[PDB]
Design a protein around this ligand. Sequence first.
Ligand SMILES: CC(=O)/C(=C/c1ccccc1)C(=O)Nc1ccc(S(N)(=O)=O)cc1
Ligand SMILES: [Cl-]
Ligand SMILES: [Zn+2]
Length: 258
Amino acid sequence: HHWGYGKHNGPEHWHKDFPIAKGERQSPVDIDTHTAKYDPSLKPLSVSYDQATSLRILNNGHAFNVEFDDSQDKAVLKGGPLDGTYRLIQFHFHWGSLDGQGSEHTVDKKKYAAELHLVHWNTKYGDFGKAVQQPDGLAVLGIFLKVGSAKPGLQKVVDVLDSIKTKGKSADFTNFDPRGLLPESLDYWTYPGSLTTPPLLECVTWIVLKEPISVSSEQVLKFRKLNFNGEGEPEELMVDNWRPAQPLKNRQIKASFK
Ligand SMILES: CC(=O)/C(=C/c1ccccc1)C(=O)Nc1ccc(S(N)(=O)=O)cc1
Ligand SMILES: [Cl-]
Ligand SMILES: [Zn+2]
């Protein structure tokens, strides 16, 4: 497959190789704050990242992934809408060419400069590859980024990007604490959806935090110096690696907060 975010291979083309692109529970979606309903049935969200073991950072030609050791319950997401235990495997971002676009989810049609995805898999399915074949296999924690003051906890990520400029490059990325990327509040919206890239599998419980984190213009400018292309190839800046909002269809977005 040769999918990407250009005119010629971008989200409007994905359905030809990945027909689920036009499915009943695609992501992202616009979060209409006036139709999402507070759900008193939601349990408190539990983000347990104290024992998180980061390993590596990889430019995959679509975004960059910070990968974790998920061979045991070291960094887990529980509670909120989730049944059981979901293990952190990686995080990555989606971002724009300019500060007015870049997020995948929108909030009353507002686009943020970027969106962080912390990807977790349901440990009752034993491995990530099995989990993505299940409707409750993954929980992705989505966090909006706006441009304002620097996020200190992001700087170690920003500073290694020079070493993974092009597709296929990786770097050692140990001892990175993903707690440094969370906002103060864990208030969230939740809905059933999909991976937002091919293969667009409908296996995700989305948990999207209401409170954005602030990052500096300098921090997001360094995201925009990455390349989609491999070393030696014509430079295509890694920008606008976001899928637009997809039809909500027969889904309800629930709020954790009044
Ligand atoms: C190795 C790798 O990158 C992956 C492989 C994979 C995933 C599923 C099936 C086969 C391979 C993967 O995890 N894909 C992915 C993760 C989160 C999101 S998203 N934007 O919905 O959070 C989008 C894409
Ligand atoms: Cl805001
Ligand atoms: Zn993502």
